[PDB]
Design a protein around this ligand. Structure first.
Ligand SMILES: CCc1cnn2c(NCc3ccc[n+](O)c3)cc(N3CCCC[C@H]3CCO)nc12
Length: 298
């Protein structure tokens, strides 16, 4: 568009480049995502247009606001509210000392509120990761890109050939389950929670089988006892090695007993057993939750 001065490139997202831009008629500063398609084919599938446009109504204080969905030329632009930092960069910048535990708790509590809202409206994210959790100077954290995965799919590589990360992917997806449920987002958020606390990714796989086997090495190879139906999933192999489950006290120290209990429920293998966002908000871990302001150096 010529509707925007394009103040900088913010980064490269799953589907295309993301810019910080100023709207000239409002003076508003926004984030613009350029999403394309191989022009020749389907194009923008008109079906992605309708369901993405529906996301303009999915508003909550912990969901990054989708301001507009512009279909023009053969390009789809999503105009979003702008936030000043993403959690991946904030975690990297906090490597030395760690994000303080009360800020970690606040962020998790706010993220669960955004999931509970979206889930109650039957919208899933499916590709939660630190890069798409955005924060501001006032202590808020918001989820970006809810609903897009349903619309475009999740590719192996991005538009610029970068590898899409598998680290936060739920085991039912890796085992080939066709139908995602809201439990996939709870798994991803559990993995992000553990990474905030320990300052290392919980399961940093570099292929689908490395990702699955990292999960099995820590939580034990799932069986029919812990996950009824697992041996029948499309990508399950009877030849998977049989690892014993480790103890949580070893996986996320120094998390206290409430935190470890909650994380265990967010990482249950059976998606039917995995805690819901609503139920997680009532867990005793959040009894003393507060809303601290982070040190942001913009
Ligand atoms: C929803 C669009 C949006 C709004 N703000 N924002 C931010 N703001 C933080 C920030 C700002 C200025 C420079 N840096 O480095 C970080 C980052 C971000 N993204 C992270 C990086 C890859 C692109 C992309 C993915 C997730 O939308 N997307 C957005």
């Amino acid at each position: 568009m010529e509707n925007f001065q394009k103040v900088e490139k913010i980064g490269e997202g799953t589907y295309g480049v993301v810019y910080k831009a100023r709207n000239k008629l409002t003076g508003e500063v926004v984030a613009l995502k350029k999403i394309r398609l191989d022009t020749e084919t389907e194009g923008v599938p008109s079906t992605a247009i309708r369901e993405i446009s529906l996301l303009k109504e999915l508003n909550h204080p912990n969901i990054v606001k989708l301001l507009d969905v512009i279909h023009t030329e053969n390009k789809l632009y999503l105009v979003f509210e702008f936030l000043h930092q993403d959690l991946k960069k904030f975690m990297d910048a906090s490597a030395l000392t760690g994000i303080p535990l009360p800020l970690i708790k606040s962020y998790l509590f706010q993220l669960l509120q955004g999931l509970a809202f979206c889930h109650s409206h039957r919208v899933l994210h499916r590709d939660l990761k630190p890069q798409n959790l955005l924060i501001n100077t006032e202590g808020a954290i918001k989820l970006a890109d809810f609903g897009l995965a349903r619309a475009f799919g999740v590719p192996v590589r991005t538009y610029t050939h970068e590898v899409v990360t598998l680290w936060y992917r739920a085991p039912e997806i890796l085992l080939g389950c066709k139908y995602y449920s809201t439990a996939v987002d709870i798994w991803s958020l559990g993995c992000i929670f553990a990474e905030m606390v320990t300052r290392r990714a919980l399961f940093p796989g570099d292929s689908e089988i490395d990702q699955l086997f990292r999960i099995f090495r820590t939580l034990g190879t799932p069986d029919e006892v812990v996950w009824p139906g697992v041996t029948s999933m499309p990508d399950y192999k009877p030849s998977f090695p049989k690892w014993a489950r480790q103890d949580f006290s070893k996986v996320v120290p120094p998390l206290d007993e409430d935190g470890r209990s909650l994380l265990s429920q967010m990482l249950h293998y059976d998606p039917n057993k995995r805690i819901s966002a609503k139920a997680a908000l009532a867990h005793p871990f959040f009894q003393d939750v507060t809303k601290p302001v982070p040190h942001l150096r913009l």
